[PDB]
Write an enzyme that holds these catalytic residues in place. Structure first.
Site, short mmCIF file in Angstrom:
data_model
loop_
_atom_site.label_atom_id
_atom_site.label_comp_id
_atom_site.label_asym_id
_atom_site.label_seq_id
_atom_site.Cartn_x
_atom_site.Cartn_y
_atom_site.Cartn_z
N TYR A 45 0.81 -1.07 -0.04
CA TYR A 45 0.08 -0.04 0.03
C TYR A 45 0.96 1.14 0.16
O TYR A 45 1.97 1.24 0.36
CB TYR A 45 -0.94 0.00 1.12
CG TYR A 45 -0.17 0.37 2.49
CD1 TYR A 45 0.44 -0.59 3.31
CD2 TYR A 45 0.08 1.55 2.90
CE1 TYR A 45 1.08 -0.43 4.38
CE2 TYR A 45 0.66 2.05 4.07
CZ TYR A 45 1.07 0.86 4.81
OH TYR A 45 1.95 1.21 5.90
N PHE A 55 2.66 10.75 4.40
CA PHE A 55 2.67 9.54 3.51
C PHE A 55 3.36 8.62 4.19
O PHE A 55 4.39 8.63 4.95
CB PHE A 55 3.59 10.15 2.07
CG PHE A 55 3.59 8.86 1.09
CD1 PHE A 55 4.57 7.97 0.97
CD2 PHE A 55 2.60 9.01 0.07
CE1 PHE A 55 4.76 6.95 0.06
CE2 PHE A 55 2.56 7.88 -0.78
CZ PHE A 55 3.66 6.83 -0.90
N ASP A 56 2.94 7.30 3.72
CA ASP A 56 3.29 6.15 4.25
C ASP A 56 3.47 4.89 3.39
O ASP A 56 2.32 4.93 2.46
CB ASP A 56 2.78 5.65 5.40
CG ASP A 56 2.97 4.14 6.07
OD1 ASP A 56 4.03 3.81 6.28
OD2 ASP A 56 2.03 3.62 6.25
N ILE A 75 -8.00 0.19 10.22
CA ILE A 75 -9.04 1.01 10.05
C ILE A 75 -10.00 0.49 9.12
O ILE A 75 -10.10 -0.31 8.46
CB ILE A 75 -8.68 2.56 9.33
CG1 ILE A 75 -8.08 2.43 7.90
CG2 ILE A 75 -7.78 3.28 10.33
CD1 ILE A 75 -7.90 3.50 7.22
N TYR A 101 -9.80 7.84 11.11
CA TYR A 101 -9.42 8.14 12.55
C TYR A 101 -10.44 9.23 13.00
O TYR A 101 -10.33 9.79 14.24
CB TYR A 101 -7.99 8.79 12.48
CG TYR A 101 -6.92 8.07 12.02
CD1 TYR A 101 -6.64 7.75 10.72
CD2 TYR A 101 -6.38 7.17 12.88
CE1 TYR A 101 -5.80 6.68 10.38
CE2 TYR A 101 -5.44 6.18 12.85
CZ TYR A 101 -5.19 5.97 11.21
OH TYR A 101 -4.30 5.20 11.18
N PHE A 118 -5.77 6.07 -0.08
CA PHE A 118 -4.55 4.85 -0.25
C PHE A 118 -4.73 4.17 -1.62
O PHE A 118 -5.78 4.10 -2.31
CB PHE A 118 -5.03 3.92 0.73
CG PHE A 118 -4.75 4.07 2.18
CD1 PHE A 118 -5.56 4.78 3.00
CD2 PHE A 118 -3.65 3.65 2.64
CE1 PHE A 118 -5.28 4.87 4.39
CE2 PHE A 118 -3.19 3.49 3.96
CZ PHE A 118 -4.13 4.38 4.84
#
Ligand SMILES: COc1ccc(CC[C@H]2OC(=O)[C@@H]3CCCCN3C(=O)[C@@H](C3CCCCC3)c3cc(OC)c(c(OC)c3)OC[C@H](O)[C@H](O)COc3cccc2c3)cc1OC
Length: 128
Positions: A45, A55-56, A75, A101, A118
């Site tokens: 992802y 960003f991740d 989530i 969240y 995402f």
């Protein structure tokens, strides 16, 4: 990548039909099967706040992300979204706060009432 600037593009995949998780297919998968609740799913992802501030990615670690579908280990939008995907599928999800969240947020990483975006690649899955 980013969400469209003026109108929401994706299909509403929520059970409540609340427009909280909107999906766009970015690569059609090659598998015929969708994972079931309880399945162990393996993904790559890329995720960001809709505005780009954070960003991740699993690719940053070259480490596929592994979770039990429907457990609430992730989530809500991921349990809902990955449950619609085929092996090899790449999807873009636009996720409203209720499915991420919320109004509480998760500072310092995620503000209150943040929309997330995402890209998820479903690699494989199995029953537990
Ligand atoms: C049922 O509802 C929830 C369930 C679980 C959680 C905890 C957060 C959970 O992260 C996620 O669910 C999503 C989807 C799976 C990939 C990670 N992710 C994230 O939101 C990212 C965000 C994405 C937007 C940009 C900043 C980082 C995201 C990536 C992170 O690290 C890779 C985060 C993180 O913390 C908020 C969020 O750091 C947390 C930890 O330090 C550690 O890295 C582990 O990260 C995980 C592991 C498992 C699950 C997650 C993070 C909150 C929920 O609701 C609010």
């Amino acid at each position: 990548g980013a969400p469209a600037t003026v109108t929401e593009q994706g299909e509403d995949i929520t059970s409540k039909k609340d427009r909280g998780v909107l999906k766009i297919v970015k690569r059609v998968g090659n598998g015929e099967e969708t994972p079931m609740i309880g399945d162990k799913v393996y993904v790559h992802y890329k995720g960001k706040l809709s505005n780009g501030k954070k960003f991740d990615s699993s690719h940053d670690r070259n480490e596929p992300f592994v979770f039990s579908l429907g457990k609430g280990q992730v989530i809500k939008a991921w349990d809902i979204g990955v449950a619609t995907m085929k092996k090899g599928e790449i999807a873009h999800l636009l996720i409203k706060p209720e499915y991420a969240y919320g109004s509480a947020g998760s500072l310092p990483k995620i503000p209150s009432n943040a929309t997330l975006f995402f890209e998820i690649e479903l690699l494989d899955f199995k029953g537990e």
